[PDB]
């Protein structure tokens, strides 16, 4: 059936492929999922012919976790397999080394030789790892060497590993288990950076500091805030500032240690605007966030 002659060299892959062609395993099912960074994700379903074999050194758990493949768009894509209704799955690849122990796999075969001459050995487990080389027998509990032939046993398996797709203010990206909860979500869209969960703030576009007055018991802090605004009489509106944890005032003073990436655009505690202070005073590292927060006001 292989259409070869006596003494002719052969490949285990093609022999097993022909055997499975003449075998009867049509009821087997295998479903795989492919995830790309930007373009999109796809689902792949395979029948018994494709389910039995795959080209790679991946084990069962390695295939479950995911594989790396190049996408047609030039980016790198992630592929993983969680589906099985079949007795076994076979894995093979170009030569490489592997380490295995008793109970971690079904059986494996070893090949060591040149392109025109090679030797084949198989490993099987009954009580421990057993290796047979023709009339020779080897028994051990652990083994490590250049092995590329994988056979695994499974009845049926299915879990809930799923990809996630999200949009970043103008761009749709797909990732596996992404940290999207750190962003802020509007309806069904996320914002640029990742702050702590807080109400966003919006600065004035190309506008001035609106020429409003700051009032506080800490007169030095209020004067520093006014200097941040470039205050000139008369005042358009007046607001009062109170220090944490006193939230009764119009504005709340917050220590710079609570800075978050979104605070470069604006900062908020509750619905009221907030200001930054160090040692009950302003400094440049707080002057810039205070400038942006006043631009929000």
């Amino acid at each position: 059936y292989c259409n070869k002659t006596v003494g002719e060299l052969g490949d285990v892959r093609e022999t097993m492929s022909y055997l499975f062609q003449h075998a009867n395993l049509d009821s087997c099912k295998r479903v795989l999922n492919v995830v790309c960074k930007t373009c999109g994700q796809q689902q792949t379903t395979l029948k018994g012919v494709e389910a039995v074999m795959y080209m790679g050194t991946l084990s069962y758990e390695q295939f479950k976790k995911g594989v790396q493949i190049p996408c047609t768009c030039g980016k790198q894509a992630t592929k993983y397999l969680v589906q099985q209704e079949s007795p076994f799955v076979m894995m093979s690849a170009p030569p490489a080394q592997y380490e295995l122990k008793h109970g971690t796999f079904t059986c494996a075969s070893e090949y060591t030789g040149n392109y025109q001459c090679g030797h084949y050995k198989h490993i099987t487990s009954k009580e421990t790892l057993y290796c047979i080389d023709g009339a020779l027998l080897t028994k051990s509990s652990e083994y490590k060497g250049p092995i590329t032939d994988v056979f695994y046993k499974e009845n049926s398996y299915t879990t809930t590993i799923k990809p996630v797709t999200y949009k970043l203010d103008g761009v749709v990206c797909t990732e596996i288990d992404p940290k999207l909860d750190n962003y802020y979500k509007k309806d069904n869209s996320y914002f640029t950076e990742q702050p702590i969960d807080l109400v966003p703030n919006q600065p004035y576009p190309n506008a001035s500091f609106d020429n409003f007055k700051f009032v506080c018991d800490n007169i030095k802090f209020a004067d520093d805030l006014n200097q941040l605004t470039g205050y000139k009489k008369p005042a358009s509106r007046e607001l009062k500032v109170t220090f944490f944890p006193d939230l009764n005032g119009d504005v709340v003073a917050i220590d710079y240690k609570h800075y978050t990436p979104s605070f470069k655009k604006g900062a908020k505690l509750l619905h009221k605007p907030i200001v930054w202070h160090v040692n009950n005073a302003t400094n440049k590292a707080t002057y810039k966030p205070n400038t942006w927060c006043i631009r929000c006001l």
Binding site: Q43, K272, P273
Partner: protein, 482 residues
């Protein structure tokens, strides 16, 4: 002056060759402005970059204004003033803020009306025809009154708010305060605190007037900001919301962000964020016939918006029907073993939506009742037993065994079947058990019973102890555990 023309760009250039464009802070053209001057060099826009948020760039017959997007933040009258920074002349431009900027068509038209310049308008590629009914701004009371006066909108004011009423009288001198409608520069409506928020909302709906008002209940009745936002969403007429605290404005914006789009587009966006729905796979790509929807197997779905309807294999299905069909994909199924002689080959397939009892009836597993318990993943591949109900048999069992448990028999049988799998050798004439399922204390109790004087009231229990001391410890242990 605002006028919309059906002529092409070159034909409209006959009226005026000046063009008005929109760019970001870095000078990058917005898609409409980018398509308008795609054949002309755009480096002069970025020549003076970076700018402040809101600026104007002019060169030759091309005019541009820097505007932000609502994703980062923006308001209506600030955009109007930014456009007012442009010198007053005749220009050809699209509606400002359309597309990615997030501004609606009505807001753009109002902004253009506020501007002193005359504009000739061409249709935008991405038009925000759907109106954002609720919008929060940081403008103070005087700016709110100026906006209401310029747009001729009505502002309801509660007379109990002494500071706001005093400020209104300070700006619009001579106005009287009473329960009535006053038209003096801006449009005013006054009412006492006795009027409920719901009654005020109903009155505003009856008037059908466009409004610029404070969040109802938050300032006038002491309600929280979320309740005010919900009440304003209950209001039908569009309104502009502002408060003295910009942080409250940001909180109101965050409230408005959730459930912002229409239900069909909101559902599509939710599926896109999830990237799937139960077992479908979302694609979200555009084709010549329609935009793609979630896909399962080899068949894909496509939708066309306004009205949002879905297409599948040449058939059209409504949004509600498709959503209802997708919601019914909670079918979780498991395969479990069932038997009577406990050695035969028999298998049952059960769904995880319902409990074991709802589908089959009285069922137990290793002494644990599963009749009123919904399965999970770890229950796959387990063995179960089912027995009908008979009160007379249970009464007889109670009479024999002196136990009132109605579920005793099923748990006892389930435990006995599992315990029969074990082996019980002996050491020094005393039973020994290989360690399994934490049987150490059970073995210790067995050893204690083997050495002490012991009698029982139930004859069945006494016979079971007799058999256990002879090596048939499985049944006795099962009875003890039950």
């Amino acid at each position: 002056c605002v006028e919309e023309v059906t002529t092409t760009l070159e034909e409209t250039k006959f009226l005026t060759e000046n063009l008005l464009l929109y760019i970001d802070i870095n000078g990058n053209l917005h898609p409409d402005s980018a398509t308008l001057v795609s054949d002309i060099d755009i480096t002069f826009l970025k020549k003076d970059a970076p700018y402040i948020v809101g600026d104007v760039v002019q060169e030759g017959v091309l005019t541009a204004v820097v505007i932000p997007t609502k994703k980062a933040g923006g308001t209506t009258e600030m955009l109007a003033k930014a456009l007012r920074k442009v010198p007053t002349d005749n220009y050809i431009t699209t509606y400002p803020g359309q597309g990615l900027n997030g501004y609606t068509v009505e807001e753009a038209k109002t902004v253009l009306k506020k501007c002193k310049s005359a504009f000739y308008i061409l249709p935008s590629i991405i038009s925000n025809e759907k109106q954002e009914i609720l919008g929060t701004v940081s403008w103070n009371l005087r700016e709110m009154l100026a906006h209401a006066e310029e747009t001729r909108k009505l502002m309801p004011v509660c007379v109990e708010t002494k500071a706001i009423v005093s400020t209104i009288q300070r700006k619009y001198k001579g106005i009287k305060i009473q329960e009535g409608v006053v038209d003096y520069g801006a449009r005013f409506y006054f009412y006492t605190s006795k009027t409920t928020v719901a009654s005020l909302i109903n009155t505003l709906n009856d008037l059908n007037e466009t409004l610029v008002t404070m969040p109802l209940g938050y300032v006038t009745h002491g309600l929280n900001l979320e309740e005010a936002a919900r009440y304003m969403r209950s209001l039908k007429v569009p309104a502009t919301v502002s408060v003295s605290s910009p942080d409250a404005v940001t909180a109101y914006n965050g409230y408005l962000t959730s459930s912002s789009k229409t239900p069909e587009e909101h559902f599509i966006e939710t599926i896109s964020l999830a990237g799937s729905y139960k077992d479908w796979s979302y694609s979200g790509q555009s084709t010549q016939l329609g935009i793609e929807f979630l896909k399962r197997g080899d068949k894909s779905v496509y939708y066309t918006s306004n009205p949002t309807t879905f297409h599948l294999d040449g058939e059209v299905i409504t949004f509600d029907n498709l959503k209802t069909l997708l919601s019914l994909r909670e079918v979780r199924t498991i395969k479990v073993f069932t038997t009577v002689d406990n050695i035969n080959l028999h298998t049952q397939v059960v769904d995880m939506s319902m409990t074991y009892g709802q589908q089959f009836g009285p069922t137990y597993l290793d002494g644990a009742d599963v009749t009123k318990i919904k399965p999970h993943n770890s229950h796959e591949g387990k063995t179960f037993y089912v027995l009908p109900n008979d009160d007379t048999l249970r009464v007889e069992a109670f009479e024999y065994y002196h136990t009132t448990d109605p579920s005793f028999l099923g748990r006892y049988m389930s435990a006995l079947n599992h315990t029969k799998k074990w082996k019980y050798p002996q050491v020094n004439g005393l039973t020994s058990i290989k360690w399994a399922d934490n049987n150490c204390y059970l073995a210790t109790a067995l050893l204690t019973l083997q050495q002490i004087e012991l009698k029982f009231n139930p004859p069945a229990l006494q016979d079971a102890y007799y058999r256990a001391r002879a090596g048939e410890a499985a049944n006795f242990c099962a009875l003890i555990l039950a």
